[PDB]
Amino acid sequence: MKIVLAYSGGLDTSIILKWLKETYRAEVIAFTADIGQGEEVEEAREKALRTGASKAIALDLKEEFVRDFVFPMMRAGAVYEGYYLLGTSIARPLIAKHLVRIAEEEGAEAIAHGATGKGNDQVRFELTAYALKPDIKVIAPWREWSFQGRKEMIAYAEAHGIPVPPYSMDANLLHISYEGGVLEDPWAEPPKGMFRMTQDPEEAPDAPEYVEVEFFEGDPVAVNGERLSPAALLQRLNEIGGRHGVGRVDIVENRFVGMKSRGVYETPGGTILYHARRAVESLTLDREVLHQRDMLSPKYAELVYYGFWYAPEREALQAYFDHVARSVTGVARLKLYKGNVYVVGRKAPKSLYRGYDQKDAEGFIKIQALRLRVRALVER
Amino acid sequence: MKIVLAYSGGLDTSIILKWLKETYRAEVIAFTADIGQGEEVEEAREKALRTGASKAIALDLKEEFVRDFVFPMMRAGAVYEGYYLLGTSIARPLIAKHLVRIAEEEGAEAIAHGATGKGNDQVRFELTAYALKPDIKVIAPWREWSFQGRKEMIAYAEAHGIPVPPYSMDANLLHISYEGGVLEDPWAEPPKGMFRMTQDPEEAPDAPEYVEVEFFEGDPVAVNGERLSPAALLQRLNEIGGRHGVGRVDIVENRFVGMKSRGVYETPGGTILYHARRAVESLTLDREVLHQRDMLSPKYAELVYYGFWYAPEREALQAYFDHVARSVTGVARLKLYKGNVYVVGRKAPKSLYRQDGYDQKDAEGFIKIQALRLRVRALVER
Amino acid sequence: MKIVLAYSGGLDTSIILKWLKETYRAEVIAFTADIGQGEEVEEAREKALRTGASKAIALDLKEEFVRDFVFPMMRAGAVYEGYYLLGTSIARPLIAKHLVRIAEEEGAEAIAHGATGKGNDQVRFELTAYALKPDIKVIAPWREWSFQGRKEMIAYAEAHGIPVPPYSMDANLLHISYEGGVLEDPWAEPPKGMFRMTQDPEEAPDAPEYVEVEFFEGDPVAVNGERLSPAALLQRLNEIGGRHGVGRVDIVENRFVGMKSRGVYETPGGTILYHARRAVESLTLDREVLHQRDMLSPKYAELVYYGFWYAPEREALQAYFDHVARSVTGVARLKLYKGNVYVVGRKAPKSLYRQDLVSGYDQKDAEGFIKIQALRLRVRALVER
Amino acid sequence: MKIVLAYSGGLDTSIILKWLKETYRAEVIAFTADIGQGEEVEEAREKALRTGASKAIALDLKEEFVRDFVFPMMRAGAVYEGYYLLGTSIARPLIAKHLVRIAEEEGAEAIAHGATGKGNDQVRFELTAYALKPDIKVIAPWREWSFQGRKEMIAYAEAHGIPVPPYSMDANLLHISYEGGVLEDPWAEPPKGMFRMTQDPEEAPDAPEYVEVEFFEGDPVAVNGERLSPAALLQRLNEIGGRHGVGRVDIVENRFVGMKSRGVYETPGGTILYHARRAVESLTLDREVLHQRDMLSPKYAELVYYGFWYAPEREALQAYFDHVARSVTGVARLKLYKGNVYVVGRKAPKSLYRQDLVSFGYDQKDAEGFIKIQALRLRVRALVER
Ligand SMILES: Nc1ncnc2c1ncn2[C@@H]1O[C@H](COP(=O)(O)OP(=O)(O)OP(=O)(O)O)[C@@H](O)[C@H]1O
Ligand SMILES: Nc1ncnc2c1ncn2[C@@H]1O[C@H](COP(=O)(O)OP(=O)(O)OP(=O)(O)O)[C@@H](O)[C@H]1O
Ligand SMILES: Nc1ncnc2c1ncn2[C@@H]1O[C@H](COP(=O)(O)OP(=O)(O)OP(=O)(O)O)[C@@H](O)[C@H]1O
Ligand SMILES: Nc1ncnc2c1ncn2[C@@H]1O[C@H](COP(=O)(O)OP(=O)(O)OP(=O)(O)O)[C@H](O)[C@H]1O
Q: Is the CB of C170 within 6 Å of ligand 2?
C-alpha cells in the first residue's frame, strides 16, 4: 500500500509521515509544493527521506499557482466578507490537484494531509481530491489518531528521531495569514512584529511611490512598463507593496465548518492588483455589466473560501467572469503611501470615457417617474 | 403663480430666481437647507430676499439628514461601484422632500432647482419630487432657458444687481466631491492642495489614533464612550478622521444619465463608520445572513445613486437591511494613521464568537455529503 | 431516560417505537400530529399506547400548519427547482417544533423520528430541533440500527406482534408526495390510478368551474365570497381543485444530501393559490419590487427545502417578502378545467392599473427616454470603432 | 433621401409609407420579414409597391429567428414575470438588425417603424438600431405626426386610396399575442374565438398524446425521433401542442415605458420546449449550477423584454447560460392533454441520476456529521439568545 502525503516539512507532517508508515504499514511518498512560502522546498524533500519517505517529490508550482488559480480568481473580483482576498483558499486546490496526480502515477490508492479535524482546510483539500478522482481514499490523521495533546505528540516525535523546535501561519506568493494565540481575542490588536511580508506602516518610506500595472485581457501583464510572467509579476508587486506596508487585513470571518475565526492577512501584491484592476474596469467595462458582475463576485468568493474550486458552479460563474474580463485592457497608476494604496490614474485603448440634449433628459425623467406618480396617486 | 426654489445662495440660483419671476410672472419662495455645506444658510436666506424672493426659508436639516438618510443607507452597507459612499446622492431626496413640503404649505403649484440639464442631480430632485407629490410642476431652468454662454449669464446677473465672483465641489456632512476641470483627465492625479475636509496624509500626525464607535441597533450611538446625536456623531468622526486624512476616493463612475465621470471624494467620518459597522457585524451577524445581505447591497447602492430613494424597491430592500442591522450591537475599535483606517478590535454583548458542538468524525461526514454530487459528476464524465 | 418520538402510526414508526425501548431502555412519549393526512390520529395515539408508548399525544395542528407555515412560505412565491411547491418541507419544521416543546414539558432529553439517512427530512427535523433547543439529543433509528432490509423488519415487527401489510407517500393539507418503487425510473410515467388527492383529468368535469380567491394583506381570506380560516380555506381549494385534477407535478429533484430523486406531487389548492396570488400581485405590486422579489424567491425556496426554516437567513428574507406581500390585496378569478388552472381575471382596491396609459407622459417623452437609454450602447459601438 | 421602413403590410404601416413620402419626400424602401406571421409576405411586398415604395424587400427569416434569437433565449430559461415567454420581444431585434443592414446597403440615411409612441416596441426597435449603427437616424411617425384617433387615420388612408376595414394581434413562429380593446379590463375573461394558433382546450382531442423532444447541447434537435431544423422544429411543436390547446397565458404585465398592460399569449411549441428543457436539465445539470442559473433567468428575461438584446449585459449573461446549456443533452417525454403539458419521462446519455443512491457509495452515518456541522451556527445562535 502506497500513500501520497502533502508534506510541508514541519513537525506535524513529519510526525504524520511516521504515523502513516506505522498505522497503515504503507509506503509513504512525500510531496512538497513550492507556492511561494519562502522556504527551501528541497530541504523538505530531503527531510522527508530522512523521516522515512520511500520517495520525496518537490515541485516549483509558483507559476501554475498564479496563472491557473490566483489570476482566474482575481478576474472575478473575489472578496470574502468585505476584506479577505482568499490567499489560503485558492492555494489548496493546487496542492490537492498534484497529490491526486502523483497518487495516480505512483499507483497509490490513498493521499494524506495534516489539516486539522475542525478547520476548513481539510474540506478544501478533500473537496478537490474527490472531485478530481472520486474513488481516491483520503487519510486525515488528525481525524483518526488518538494523541491526547501536544506534549504527547512532542514525545512521539522525539521517540522517532524527529527534531522538535505565539500564533499559526500560512504563506504563499499571494499572502501570509496569522491566527490563534494572542489573535484569538478579537478585541486585542495584533502584536507588534508579527507581520513578515509587509513593512510596518509607521516604518514605511516618507515618500510615496508610484506604480503602474498593465492589464491585457483581464490579466496583469506588466509592472512599470516591464513585461512579467504571472509569478514574477505577483512577486514584484509584493516587493513594491510590501515595502510600504500595503495589504493588511484584520477580520473575524465566518468559517464553513466551525463558527467564527479571527484572522490577520497581508496581501501587498494582490491588494495593489485589486485596485489596479478596478481602475482599468472603470474605463473599459459597461455600467450594467459592472453592476451585474459585482453582484456575483461575493457568491464566487464564498465558493472559493468553502473549497468548491473544481465544482461546476464555480466553473459556470468563471465563464461569466472571464467573458467580462476580456475587456479589461489598459493601465492603472497607483500611489503607495504608508499602508495605503491610491488610484491616481488610468487609461485604456478602448476607454468608454468621453449623444443627447436637455430635452432628452426631461423625457427620461418623465418615463422613469411614471410608476412612482401612479403609486402616489393610488395611495390617494 | 408661486414657485418654491431650492436656493443655494450662489450666482446661478440667484440668476434663476430673477429668471423665474419674469419668465413665469410668478413670485418665488426661496428655500436653503443647511446639510453641512459649511456655509451660513441665513445669509443665503437674506440674499434671496434681496434678489427678489417673496419669502425666504432656511432650515437646519443636519440631524434629519444623518438620522433619516445617511444612517438608513449605511445600515445597508451601500457602496457604489466599489468605492463611492454616495455623499451627494442621499442628500438630494432630503432637499426635494422639503421643496414639496413648502410648496404644499405655501400653496405653490411648482418647484425649481438649478441642477444642470445634462447631469444626474436633476433626476434625483425630480424622481423624489414626483414620488412625494405626483401633481407637482417641476421647472428646471437649465433645461428650459436660452442663455447660450457663461458670459451672457454674467451680464444678466450684473444687469439685475446680482453680485458676481479649476474644478467644482459639493459639500455636506457626509463628504465633499470634486469633479471637472483638471480632474477631467482620468490619467492626471488630482492637484495638490485640493482636499478641504481631510488633511493630506503626508501632513497627518506621526502618532496613530485609536477610536471606538459603539453601535446600538444598526446605528452608531457613541464615539469613545461619548453619546452623540446622529449629526454630532458624524461631525465628530469627520474631525477625528479628517485630521488623519482618512476617506479619499478617486474613481471614474458610471452615471445614470450620460456616460462616465471622474470624481474625487473625501468621506472621513463615513469611511470610519463603514469599517466600524462591518467590525461589529463580524461578531453579531450570522454567516448566511451576512452573505445574502452583501449580495443585495450593490443593488441598493445603485438605487440610491440613480435617485430612487422614495421608491418602493428601495423601501422593500430597506425592510430587509433594517431587519438585519437590528442585531448590530457592539463596539468597534479602529486605528487611524496617515490616510488609512485599520480595524484593530471589536466586541459585542451578543457576540457569536467563542474562540473555543461537533467532533472530527462529524467533519468527515460533512465532507462526504458535500462531495457526493462532485464524485457522481466525475464518474459520469468517466 | 425519556424519548419523544414523532409517531405517525405506520409500520416503520411502530417498529421504531419498539426499537427505542429495547435499544435505549427508556420511556417513549409518542406524538402524532394532525396536519391533514386524512387519518384519525386518535387511532395512532391508541396504537402507540398499545405498541409500548408510556404516553401518547395527538394534536390538531391544521390551522397552525397553514397559518404559521404554509402562508408565510406562500407570501414569498416559494418554488423549488421550477415546480415543487414544498408540500413536505414546510410540514417538518412544525412537527419538530412540537417534539421539542413536548420533550421540554416531559423532561425528555431526546427526540426521535423515522426519516431515513438518505433524505432531506432527517435534516429538516434535526436542523429545526437543534435551532429551537441546542442541547436536545436526536435519535434517528434508520441511521443506527442493523436491519438489512424490508424482510428483517417485517419479522422483527411480528416478533413484537405488530400489524403488517410499489411507492411510498406523504400526505398533509398542502399535498401528497409519491416516491420510490416504480417511480425510481425517471423514464417511467407514474402508474395510472396512483393519485389520491386529485381526480384524473380524463375523469374531471366536462364543464369548467370558476373560482375566486380574495387576498387581504398577502394571505388568502375567502373563496367565492365565503370567508374561511387558513386551514378551512386550503381544504376548500383542495376539494374544488382536486375535482378538476389540478396541480400535478412530476420532477427529478436535487436533494440537499447530494443525489437526485424522482418525485411526483399533487398540490391542488396550493396550485390555485399560487396563480391566484400572482394574478393579484400583477395589479398591486410595483414593477421593480416584483422583479427583485422573484429573484429572491428561489433562494427562499431552497432554504425551506433544505430545512432552514428556523434559521436567521430565512427569517431575514421573510421580512422582505412580508413587506412586499403586505400590498397583495384584491381578488383573483380562475378557471379550472381538466388538470389546468387558467387565470381569467383579477381586481384590487389599490390597483396600479389604469386603462388610460394604454387607451403622465407623451410621445416626445419616450423619445428622450430612448436616447438616454441608448447612449452607452452607441458609445460602445463607436469605440468598437 | 432614402428611408428603410419596417413594412408589415397592414393599415398603419401603409399609412406610414404614404406619410413618409408626403412629409419627407423620401424614397421609401419597404422591408417585410417573414418570421412566421402566417401572412404571405410576398403580398405585403407587392402592396408596398402599390402603396408607393420605390423598392420592396421580403425575406424568409424563420430559421435565423429561431436559431439566433429564440434558441439562445430558451437556453437561458427566460420567463418574464412568471409567465411571458417573450414572443414579441425576441422578434424585434431581428427585424431592426435587417432594417439597419438594408439601410447601409441601400445607402439610406434613416429607418422607420410603426411602433406606437406609448409602447415598448419603439424602445426595442431603436435600442437595437442605435446599438448596431450609432450614426443611424430613426423616424417614428407615431411620435412625429399630428394624427389623433383611428377615425382620422382612416380618412387620410381612404383619401390616399389605401384599403380600409376588438383587440390587437401580433404573430410569429413563437407565439401570437392579444391586447387592447375588450382585453383592457383585467377582470374580463378573453372572448371566445380569439385564439388562432391553439385549439380550444374544450375542443381538444379526447385522448392524451405523447411527444418526445431530444436536446443536443442546450438546443432542441428532434421531435418524436425526427431530426428537424430550428424553425421546422418549432413549427412541428406548434402543430402538436396547438391541437391540444397548450401554452395559453393571461397576465397583466409591467411595461418598460407605459404602466401596466393586460396581455394574452399562446405559445404552444415554446411551452412544450420550456417543460421539456427543464426535464432534460433535471438529469444533466448540477444542483448548485441549476439554482444559480434560475436566479439569473429573471434578469435575462427583463433584459429581453426591455429590448436590450444587443447590449453587453445580455451577451455577458448569455455566456453564462450557454456554458450551462452545453450540458443539456437527452430526451424528454411529455403528455399533452386538454391545454396541459405534463412531464412523464426523461433520459440522458450523461444523466447524473443514480438509482442506487436513493434505493434501499453513500453511508447513512455521514448524514449525521453533515447535520451537526450545518446545525452549529444555529445552536450557537440559540445559546447566545441564551
Ligand atoms: N443647501 C441647498 N439648499 C437648497 N437647494 C440646494 C442646496 N444645495 C444644492 N441645492 C440645489 O441643487 C442645485 C445645485 O447644485 P450645486 O449644488 O451643484 O449648485 P451651484 O451650481 O453649486 O450653486 P448655484 O445654483 O447657486 O450656482 C442648485 O441649483 C439648487 O437648486
Ligand atoms: N403526522 C406525523 N406526526 C408525527 N411524526 C410524523 C408525522 N408524519 C410523519 N412524521 C415523521 O416523519 C418520519 C416519516 O416519514 P414518512 O411519513 O415519509 O415515513 P414511512 O416510513 O413512510 O411511515 P411510517 O414511519 O409511519 O411507517 C416518520 O418516521 C415520523 O417520525
Ligand atoms: N414582419 C415585419 N416586417 C417588418 N416590420 C415589421 C414586421 N412585423 C412588425 N413590424 C414593425 O413593427 C411595427 C408594428 O407592429 P404591430 O405589428 O404591432 O403593428 P400594427 O400597427 O398593429 O400593424 P401595421 O403597422 O402593420 O398595420 C410595425 O409598424 C412595423 O414597423
Ligand atoms: N507546501 C506544501 N506542500 C504540500 N502540502 C502542504 C504544503 N503546505 C501545506 N500543506 C498541507 O496543508 C495542510 C497543512 O497545513 P499547515 O500548512 O497549516 O500545517 P502545519 O500543521 O502548519 O504543517 P506541518 O505539520 O507540515 O509542519 C496539511 O498539513 C499539509 O499536508
A: yes
